[PDB]
Design a protein around this ligand. Sequence first.
Ligand SMILES: Nc1ncnc2c1ncn2[C@@H]1O[C@H](COP(=O)(O)OP(=O)(O)O)[C@@H](O)[C@H]1O
Ligand SMILES: [Mg+2]
Lengths: 754, 788
Amino acid sequence: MQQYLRLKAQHPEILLFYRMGDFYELFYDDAKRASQLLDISLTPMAGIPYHAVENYLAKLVNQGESVAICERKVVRIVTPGTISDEALLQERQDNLLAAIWQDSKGFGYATLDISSGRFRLSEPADRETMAAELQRTNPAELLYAEDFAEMSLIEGRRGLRRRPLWEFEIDTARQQLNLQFGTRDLVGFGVENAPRGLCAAGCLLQYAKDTQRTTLPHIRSITMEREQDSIIMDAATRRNLEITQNLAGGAENTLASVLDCTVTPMGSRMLKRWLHMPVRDTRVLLERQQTIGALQDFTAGLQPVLRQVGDLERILARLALRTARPRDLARMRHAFQQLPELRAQLETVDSAPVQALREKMGEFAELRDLLERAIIDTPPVLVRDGGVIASGYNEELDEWRALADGATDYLERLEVRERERTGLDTLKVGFNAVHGYYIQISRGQSHLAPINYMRRQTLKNAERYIIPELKEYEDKVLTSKGKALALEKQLYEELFDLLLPHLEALQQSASALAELDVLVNLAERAYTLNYTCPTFIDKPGIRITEGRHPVVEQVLNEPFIANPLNLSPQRRMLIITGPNMGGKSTYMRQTALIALMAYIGSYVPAQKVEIGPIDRIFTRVGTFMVEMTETANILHNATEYSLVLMDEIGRGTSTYDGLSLAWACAENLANKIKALTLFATHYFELTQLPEKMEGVANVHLDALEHGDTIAFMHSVQDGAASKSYGLAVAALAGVPKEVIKRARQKLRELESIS
Amino acid sequence: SAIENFDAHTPMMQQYLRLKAQHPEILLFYRMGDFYELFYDDAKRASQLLDISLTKRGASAGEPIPMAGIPYHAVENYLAKLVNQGESVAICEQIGDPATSKGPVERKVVRIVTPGTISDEALLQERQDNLLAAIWQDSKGFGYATLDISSGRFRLSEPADRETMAAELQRTNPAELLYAEDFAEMSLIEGRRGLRRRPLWEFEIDTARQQLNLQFGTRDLVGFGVENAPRGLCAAGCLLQYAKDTQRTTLPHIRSITMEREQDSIIMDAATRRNLEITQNLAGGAENTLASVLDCTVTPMGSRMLKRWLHMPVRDTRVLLERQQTIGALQDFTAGLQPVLRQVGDLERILARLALRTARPRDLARMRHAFQQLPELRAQLETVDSAPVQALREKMGEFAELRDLLERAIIDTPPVLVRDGGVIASGYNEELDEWRALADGATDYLERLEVRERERTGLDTLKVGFNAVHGYYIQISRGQSHLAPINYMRRQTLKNAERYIIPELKEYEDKVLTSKGKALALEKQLYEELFDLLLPHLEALQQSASALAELDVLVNLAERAYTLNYTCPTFIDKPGIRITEGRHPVVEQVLNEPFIANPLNLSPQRRMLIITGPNMGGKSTYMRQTALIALMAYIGSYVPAQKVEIGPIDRIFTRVGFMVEMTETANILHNATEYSLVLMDEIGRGTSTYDGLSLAWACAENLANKIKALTLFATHYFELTQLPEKMEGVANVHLDALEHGDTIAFMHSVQDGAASKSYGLAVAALAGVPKEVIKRARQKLRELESIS
DNA sequence: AGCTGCCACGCACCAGTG
DNA sequence: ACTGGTGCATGGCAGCT
Ligand SMILES: Nc1ncnc2c1ncn2[C@@H]1O[C@H](COP(=O)(O)OP(=O)(O)O)[C@@H](O)[C@H]1O
Ligand SMILES: [Mg+2]
C-alpha cells in the first residue's frame, strides 16, 4: 500500500480514515491526534473497527473534527457543522454551523442548523457583542476569513475552518442566497440592507452545499437577530447564571434542568434557545403568558400525546436530504396519527395563538394513510434487505412474494419427502450464499445417501448435497425474492416523491409542535412550581414579593427563604452588606433569573413581579484583574435600563485601594449610569453612601447564633449589617482561643478610627 | 425468579454458583470450553461494559439464564477494558480433564484482576506507580499501608491526624484502597477510585502479625522497625491478605516492609503538594510540572523513583551528602552512561513478572538484554572516583551465569507467548530437538509425496494440503476426481475439489500431530523451568534493578545540574534559608524573557517576611521557588541558584486564597514547629472590612511570637507592613514595580522594606475601568490616606 | 482483497430408543 | 440410563467469489 498519501493531499486539514480490512487506519498527525481524542493505541498508525464507525465518527465530530472515509478514493466526509444522521447528534442539543468575518466597520455573523433549516444572521458592532454571540450560539464548526484580524475571539475553539476572502464576497453571496430561497430580492426576510452578515451567510451556505452535494430545500428563509430585540448578556453572565451549563462544565443544577420538562427533543432544543434569548418586546411576551395560562388545565391531556410525535424536526431534515430510513418514515407516520387527538384537545382552549398553533400543526391525513398502507408496523432499521413495504399496497409485489413463498413451501415439503423416502431422521434442507440450497444428511447417516445426491461440501459431522430438483426451486425463490426486493426499493423511493411536495407544510407542523411542547411545558412548570404571572411597567424597576431562586429552591432540600426586592428609579441601588456565604450571591442571581424568565414569557418564582424594560443583565458574581475587567465592562456599557449585579469588588487588593474602587463604582452606577444595581459589598464604610446620595439604600444579611454553630440566615432586611462573622467562623474551625482574642482586639482598633 | 435452590440448578450451575458466592460483588469470568462466560446480572453488566451481546442458556428451572462470553484467546483485550474502568474480575479456569470427569470439570478461581494488583505491561503505565493501599482508623489516629505489587515495595505509616492522612493519600495516590467498615472519616476516602469496603476482621492485629511474619519468614517484625506500629500493621495485614487473594501464588518479591516515620522526611500538606505542581499541574496534566523539567531519566523505573523522591524529601544528612557527591562525580559521565542505562529498561517490573511466574518470552529476552549491559556499565563506573557510585556498581551486580542461561535458552526475537511454542532454541534440550526434527519433517515428506502422487496418477491438479478440521489430505479437482485411484479414501469434499486420504499420509498425520504436541508440552516444561533456575537469585536481581533505577535518577540529576546550571546547596544546624540568585526551576524554563533571579534570607532572627507588591508582581513565584529549592535540596539534587544554604525543615505548609479556609489555618497553627517552612499566599477572609485582616494579623503574630516558624507571608493588606514594627522576627520585603503614569511595569525583583505604595488603582486602570471612575477613586483614596 | 458462515468447546436441551 | 444431534457468546480463517 504505497499509494495512499496521494489521497491525503486532496484535503490535508481533515483527518483521513483508511479501510484496511474490517477497520479504518490512520497515518502521521492523524494518528497522534486520533489517539489523543478517541483513546486508541499507536503502533505511526491507529485504527477503529468497522462495527462502530458511527460511534467513533461522532466523538471526533463532537470534538470539532471533520473525518474523511477512504475505501480507492474518498467516498464520505462528515463535518461537525453539517451532520444530520441521528447517530452523530446529541438528541437534546442544537448543532450549529457558523461563519464569522470582519469589515473595516464591523463583524458579520451567520448560524445554520442543518436539520431545522433555521438560518440566522447578525451584525455585531464591537467585539464584546460578538463574543456574547459565540458563547450563546456555540457552533460545532466555525468558518472564518484569513482576513480576520481579531483572532482572540475564536482562538481556542473547536471546529475552526479557515476560508479565503473571495468566499465572503457580497454580490456572489446575494445571488447564491436569492437562488436558494427562490426570491429576486431578500426583502421578505428582513436582511437586504445588512451586508456584513449577508457575506457570512454567503460563505456558510456555500460551505454547507459542498459538504452535502445535495439540495437543501428545507433551508427556505433567513432572519436577522437585532441587538435591541434582546436582553443582551455577556458570556461571563451566561456562565454565572448557569442558564444551560453549570460552571462545572455539565448540565446539572442549571436553569434548564429545572425548567425543561418538555416531552420531545425538538421542544427541548427550542426552550433552551428561548432561555438564552430573552426578547424585550412585551407583545410576544404577553402572548406567551396568556398561552401558558390557557394551557394549564390541558397539560396532563396534551403531553402523553405530544411525546408520541417525537423529533419530527430532525426526521424531516432526513426527508429533505433524501436519507430517511424506514423507521424515520414510520415515526413520521406515528406523529401524523397524534394530530387529530392534539387538534381535538386544543380546540376549546381560549387563546388566539394556541388555535394558531393548532392550524399550524396540520393534520396531513393523506400522508398518514399513505404510510399506514405503505409501511409495515415496525420496519427494519434499513431498506437494504427489504421487509419494509406493507402487504397489499402494490398488487405486483404481492404476486412476487407469493411466488417466493410458495417455492419456499415446496422446499419444506421436499425436506419431508426426502426424509420419508430415505428414512434418515437427520435429513434437512438448508440455505447458504456459498452453495445455494442443499440437502444435508449427517455424517453417521451420510453413507446411505441416495446415489442421485451430488456431493458439494463436507462438514465435520455432516455432508451436503444438491439435486436437480433442489436447484430448480433455488432459482424460483431467488428471482421472486430479487424482484420483490427491487420493487420495494423503488416503491420506497416513490414515498419520498409523495412526501417532499408537502415539505414546507411539514416543517411548519414540526415547528408548531415544537412550540406547543415548550408552551405546554412552561405552563406545567408554572402551575406545578407555584410561579405567578409577572406584569410589565413603563419606567424601569423590579418590584418582587416572596421571590426565590428557581433552581436552588428545587435542588437543595432545606426550606428556601424568600425575599422582596424594591428597585424603582427613586431607589435604584441596594448596598447589600453582611455575610455572603452564598446568601447575597443567591439573592442577586435570583433577581437576574426572575428578570430573565419574565422576558422569556414564562411565569416566575414569586408571589408578585412587576418589571420595567431591561436591555442588559450584568452579573459579576463568581484574579483581582478579571474582577476589574468584568467591572470595566459594566461601567462602559450599562444604561439606566440595565440590571447590574455586583459581588464584593475590592477583595484581592489593599483595603483602601479596594474601598476606593467600590465607592467610585457605586457612585458611578447610581449617579451617572443610573442602572438598577445590587451592589453587594463587605466594606462597612460604604453604608455611609445612602446619606451622601439620592437613590441608594442599605439592606443586609444577618446571622443568628445558637448552640455551638451559627445559622447564616438568608433574609435580606433594611439597614446596614451591624455585625461581622469571620472571627466567629474561625472559632468554630478551632483556631486557638488566644489567637481569636488578639484578633478581636485588633479588629476594634481598626474600626474605631473610621 | 423462581425458587432457585441448590437442587433446582443443573450440575453446571451448582458449581458456577458456589464459586460466584465466594465472589458475590465482582465480575466472574467462568471458563466453559473455549470461552470465558458470565451469568445473571454479570452478563447483563458485561454486555454494557464490554459491548458484547446479552444471550441466554436454555433451562428447565423456570426462566432462562442471562449469559455473555468471549473466546479465551481474546481475554486480555476485555480484561483491559474492565480494569481501566476500575472493575475487579475474578478469573476462573478449568483444572481437570473433561474426558476423565463424571460431572462438571473441576474449576478454581486462579487469579483476580483488580486495579491495584495488576502487574501486566499492558494495563500499567511505563512511568507511573500503581499502588495497592489500605487505610484504617482508630480512636486516636490512622493506619496506612501501600504496596507496589510489581516491585515488592511494602510501606507502613501511622499518620497522626486527619490532615496528614489527606496528604499521604494525595502523595501515594492508590489505584485501589481497601478500607475498614468502621471507618469514621469517610470525607478523606469517599470519592477516590478503587474503593473497597472490607470487614473489620481483616484489620485484626494478631492475624496481621502472624500473616506478615509468615510471609517474611520471621518470628517477629523487630528487624523491620514495625513491631511497635499496630495501627499500621492492621493496614498491612489487610493489604497482604488481599494481595494474596488476588494472586493465588507465592509472592517471593515481598520480602520486607518499612515504617515511614514522621521525621525521616519533609512532610507536605495537601495544599503544598498542589501549589508546587510537583508531578501534576493544577489542571491534572503533567505539562509544566517540576517533574516535567527534571525528569529526563532513561528507564521507566528511574522515572518513578525520581517522582517518589521529589514527593518525599529525606531529612537524613548522610544520604543527602552522598547523593550530592554522586551527582558531582557523575557529571562528566552522563553522556556515555545514559544511552547504555536506557537499554536496561524496566527490569523492576520484569522481575515482578518473574517473581509472579507470569513473565512471557519477551520479558525474559529484555532481562537477558539487561544483563548484557552490565559489563559496559561496570567498566564505565570504575573510573568514577566516588564511594556511593561504587556501592551502586557493586549492588548492580552482573549475573553472567543467567545471561548465559537466557542466551542459550531463548531465541533472539521470541513470540509474545509460549502458548504456541517457538520460544526455546536449538541446542538447549536434546529431547526437544529430536521432537521438532520429526515435526520438522517439512523440507521433506509432504513435497515429495505430492510430486510422486501427481506423477503416478497423471493428474496435474493434485496437491497435498492440511486443514485443521479434516486433517492432512490429497486434493484433486472435480474434473479430474473421477480418475483418482480406487485406493484413495474420500475425506473432504468441496465445491470444486475432492480431497482424499491414504494410509501413508494418515500414518504421517498421527506421527506429526503427536510429535508436535509432545514438542509443545516439553517446551512448556523447559520454559517454566527457567523460572525455577532464575528464582533463587531474585533478591540479588531486585537489588540490581533498584541500583539501576537509582543510577538512572542520579545520572539524570547530574545532567540536569549541568545543563540547567544548578549548584550544590549546603546544610546547617539551625533553621534558615539563604538563597543567592535563586530561581523558580520551572517558570524559568517555560518563559522566554530571562528569569529575574532573587535572594532570600531567612533565619531565627529574621524568620517572617511580609511580602508586598502588585498583582502580577512575582510574590507567589518567589514563594513557590523558595519551597521548591527546599524540596530539591532535600532530595539531594543540586539547586537553581548561585549559592543555597538551608537548615533543617520538618514540615512545609501552604494556604493559597470559609469553614474550610479557617480550618486549614488552624492546622498550620497547631502543627507548625520552629523548623517548619510556612507559605501563606494572601490569607485573611472576613465578612466585613477588617474582619479577615484582623485574623491574618493575629495569625502572623502567632507564627512569629509563639511558633517561631520560617514564614513567607504575601499580602495585599498594607496594614500588615506595620507588623515588623510590633513583632520581633518579622520584616518587610516587596516585589518592585515602576510608575510611568499611564502603564504597567513589573520589575520581578525582591528588595528589602515595604512597598512605597499599593497599586490597586493602577491595576484597575489596566483592566480598562473608565478613567472617569479611576479619577474619583484616587480622589477617595487621599481622603482615606489623610486619616493617619 | 472482501464476505459468509464453519468451527473452537464443554455443557445443557431435546428426541428417539433401551 | 442411553446414543445422537443439535445449538451457543466471539474471533480466526477456509472456502469461494
Ligand atoms: N522572578 C521572576 N522573573 C521573571 N518573571 C517572573 C518572576 N517572578 C514572577 N514572574 C512572572 O509573574 C507572573 C505572576 O507572578 P505572581 O507571583 O503570581 O504574582 P503575584 O505576586 O500577584 O502572585 C508569573 O506568571 C511569572 O511569569
Ligand atoms: Mg499570587
